[PDB]
Design an enzyme around this catalytic site. Sequence first.
Site, PDB file in Angstrom:
ATOM      1  N   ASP A  80      -1.388  -1.529   5.572  1.00  0.00           N
ATOM      2  CA  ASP A  80      -2.635  -1.972   6.193  1.00  0.00           C
ATOM      3  C   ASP A  80      -2.888  -3.460   5.868  1.00  0.00           C
ATOM      4  OD1 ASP A  80      -3.166  -1.215   3.482  1.00  0.00           O
ATOM      5  OD2 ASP A  80      -4.930  -0.012   4.017  1.00  0.00           O
ATOM      6  N   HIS A  81      -2.016  -4.044   5.047  1.00  0.00           N
ATOM      7  CA  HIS A  81      -1.941  -5.510   4.916  1.00  0.00           C
ATOM      8  C   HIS A  81      -0.659  -6.018   5.550  1.00  0.00           C
ATOM      9  CE1 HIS A  81      -4.993  -5.904   1.495  1.00  0.00           C
ATOM     10  NE2 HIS A  81      -4.794  -4.604   1.596  1.00  0.00           N
TER      11      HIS A  81
ATOM     12  N   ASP B 169       0.822  -1.229   0.000  1.00  0.00           N
ATOM     13  CA  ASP B 169       0.000   0.000   0.000  1.00  0.00           C
ATOM     14  C   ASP B 169       0.852   1.274   0.000  1.00  0.00           C
ATOM     15  OD1 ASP B 169      -2.381   1.441  -0.207  1.00  0.00           O
ATOM     16  OD2 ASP B 169      -3.385   0.374   1.423  1.00  0.00           O
TER      17      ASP B 169
ATOM     18  N   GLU C 227      -0.021  -3.186  -4.980  1.00  0.00           N
ATOM     19  CA  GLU C 227      -0.390  -1.795  -4.713  1.00  0.00           C
ATOM     20  C   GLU C 227       0.886  -1.003  -4.399  1.00  0.00           C
ATOM     21  OE1 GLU C 227      -3.775  -1.428  -1.957  1.00  0.00           O
ATOM     22  OE2 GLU C 227      -4.321   0.514  -2.816  1.00  0.00           O
TER      23      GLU C 227
ATOM     24  N   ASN D 170      -8.766  -9.334  -2.985  1.00  0.00           N
ATOM     25  CA  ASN D 170      -9.818  -8.377  -2.638  1.00  0.00           C
ATOM     26  C   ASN D 170     -11.211  -9.014  -2.471  1.00  0.00           C
ATOM     27  OD1 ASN D 170      -9.352  -5.695  -1.913  1.00  0.00           O
ATOM     28  ND2 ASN D 170      -8.501  -5.228  -3.945  1.00  0.00           N
TER      29      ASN D 170
ATOM     30  N   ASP E 223      -3.353 -10.001  -3.518  1.00  0.00           N
ATOM     31  CA  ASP E 223      -4.522  -9.374  -2.929  1.00  0.00           C
ATOM     32  C   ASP E 223      -5.687  -9.647  -3.853  1.00  0.00           C
ATOM     33  OD1 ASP E 223      -6.525  -7.763  -1.845  1.00  0.00           O
ATOM     34  OD2 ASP E 223      -5.282  -5.920  -1.830  1.00  0.00           O
TER      35      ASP E 223
ATOM     36  N   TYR F  48      -3.158  -7.925  -8.079  1.00  0.00           N
ATOM     37  CA  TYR F  48      -3.892  -6.962  -7.267  1.00  0.00           C
ATOM     38  C   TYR F  48      -5.249  -6.839  -7.953  1.00  0.00           C
ATOM     39  CZ  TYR F  48      -5.480  -2.526  -5.302  1.00  0.00           C
ATOM     40  OH  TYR F  48      -6.249  -1.557  -4.677  1.00  0.00           O
TER      41      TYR F  48
ATOM     42  N   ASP G  34      -5.692 -11.650   1.241  1.00  0.00           N
ATOM     43  CA  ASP G  34      -4.439 -12.020   0.568  1.00  0.00           C
ATOM     44  C   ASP G  34      -4.269 -13.530   0.677  1.00  0.00           C
ATOM     45  OD1 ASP G  34      -3.155  -9.239   0.094  1.00  0.00           O
ATOM     46  OD2 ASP G  34      -3.926  -9.183   2.146  1.00  0.00           O
TER      47      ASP G  34
END
Length: 276
Positions: free
Chosen positions: A266-267, A28, A54, A170, A168, A129, A241
């Site tokens: 934040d991951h 991120d 990301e 999502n 990720d 991603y 993830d």
Amino acid sequence: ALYEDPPDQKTSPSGKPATLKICSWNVDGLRAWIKKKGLDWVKEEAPDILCLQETKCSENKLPAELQELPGLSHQYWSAPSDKEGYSGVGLLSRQCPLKVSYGIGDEEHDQEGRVIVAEFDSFVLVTAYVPNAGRGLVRLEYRQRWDEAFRKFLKGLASRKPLVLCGDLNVAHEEIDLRNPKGNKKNAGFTPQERQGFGELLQAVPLADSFRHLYPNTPYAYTFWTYMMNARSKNVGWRLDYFLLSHSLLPALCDSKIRSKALGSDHCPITLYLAL
DNA sequence: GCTGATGCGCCGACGGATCC
DNA sequence: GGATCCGTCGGGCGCATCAGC
Ligand SMILES: [Cl-]
């Protein structure tokens, strides 16, 4: 709730030692992540292959620190052409891949910077991603079309060598994959549509969820926590993830880890051990 | 060149209602 | 009347662009 990832299992069901360690991390903001010492953590983990999502960084803006990684010297980077500062993925490897490609069919015209494919001797690695459905689900229909396109793309790949898909994705596949399922069914990451997409991905390619395969009934195991509302400190998170594997690679599977303590995004990182 | 404002992208805390 | 359901709303961080100087 809190969660403690169990110890690293480093031998396969038939007793073969792990020979390959893959780490995947949605950083991120790669430049921020490096300033927050994320590469120090990577060095400690000493993966054979590192997949990053990301990155929010075009290749010309990569920090010089990334050139000081002797054990990850083969590096491949991708960023979107018309959305600089968003998406972006990277793949860094100890050994040189046989083949590398970008995107899921038409990257040369729709340069999205979301997918890298790298073929090695015994398997094909894909890192992704996956597009977020967005606040208010504004881009859910795009996500559904993208899921279908991706599934079809991966079907082709898995038709040759075994596949490892990481990154990720999502979506929190099932209720066990996030802290607050009841209130998030109209939220990006936990719509019925995204969950069904994940199920179809497993069935169609086909693929297995490495972590859930090994730990089918383990709750509170997450890889994302919103920066807001002190969520990480409370372990109010989502498992977004994954490492997904061809069924033929399950005898090679030693472990699939969630590196909850590693900060800088934040991951958190996830790590796969395979006996090849 | 540099800073800081603004734009854009990307849900859990809480209050009130409902359930028995 | 505690537990649950459910709809509303306040909200961290990164990175690009822009204004100002
Ligand atoms: Cl590259």
